[PDB]
Design a protein around this ligand. Structure first.
Ligand SMILES: CC(=O)N[C@H]1[C@H]([C@H](O)[C@H](O)CO)O[C@@](O[C@H]2[C@@H](O)[C@@H](CO)O[C@@H](O[C@H]3[C@H](O)[C@@H](O)[C@H](O)O[C@@H]3CO)[C@@H]2O)(C(=O)O)C[C@@H]1O
Ligand code: CA
Length: 195
């Protein structure tokens, strides 16, 4: 030991055909919604943050928060952004978060921002901007805790400093009631490491 993994895996299976059935909590407001969809012969969960917030949350236990802090963690998302912004797939711990905010800019490019930084980074232009990609957030602890962001396995930004936050969920989706955001999710993992 010791390691742990928490996931949503998009599936047609009845027993597990929403995130609610994989231990995640629906956390929409207003007009926000979601539904199982099927795209490339493959299930995806379509998050529809149109006129309301639309996201899913997962609760770590007391020891899991603490283990996450000692040994570090990795959050991987496989998604495709369809429209808008505040696509917020992230982890908060009662005290801090590394928040990447993903979107499509007014030129149609897939950009990423991080809370604590200012500016956007172009991840994909053209028809690439609105296809599936694999996004990794990798948190390395120490007395100098920083994060690294990866896009189909390519270091994009490192030395991302955590920022204060009272929230304490693993979250994915459109974490915003006013910024509309739409994306499809095949996979979410949050893995707590060993040493
Ligand atoms: C990623 C994340 O942390 N998302 C939060 C968001 C964002 O921080 C926010 O959208 C900024 O873009 O806020 C969410 O909560 C807000 C939401 O419940 C709205 C209701 O529309 O209320 C906000 O508080 C209000 C408060 O009611 C007012 O009295 C006061 O003026 O301050 C706020 C006005 O904006 C909540 O903060 C959200 O749902 O968008 C929660 C996300 O998790
Ligand atoms: Ca435990």
């Amino acid at each position: 030991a010791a390691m742990a993994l928490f996931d949503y895996n998009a599936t047609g299976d009845t027993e597990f055909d929403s995130p609610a059935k994989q231990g995640w909590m629906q956390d929409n407001t207003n007009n926000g919604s979601g539904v199982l969809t099927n795209a490339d012969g493959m299930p995806a969960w379509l998050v529809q943050g149109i006129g309301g917030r639309a996201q899913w949350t997962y609760s770590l236990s007391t020891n899991q928060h603490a283990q996450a802090s000692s040994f570090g963690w990795r959050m991987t998302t496989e998604m495709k952004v369809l429209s808008g912004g505040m696509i917020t797939n992230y982890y908060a711990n009662g005290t801090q978060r590394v928040l990447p905010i993903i979107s499509l800019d007014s030129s149609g490019n897939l950009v990423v921002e991080f809370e604590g930084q200012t500016g956007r980074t172009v991840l994909a232009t053209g028809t690439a901007a609105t296809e599936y990609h694999k996004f990794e957030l990798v948190f390395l602890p120490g007395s100098n805790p920083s994060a690294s962001f990866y896009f189909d396995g390519k270091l994009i930004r490192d030395n991302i400093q955590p920022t204060a936050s009272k929230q304490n969920m693993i979250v994915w989706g459109n974490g915003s009631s006013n910024t509309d955001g739409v994306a499809a999710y095949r996979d979410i993992k949050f893995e707590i490491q060993g040493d």
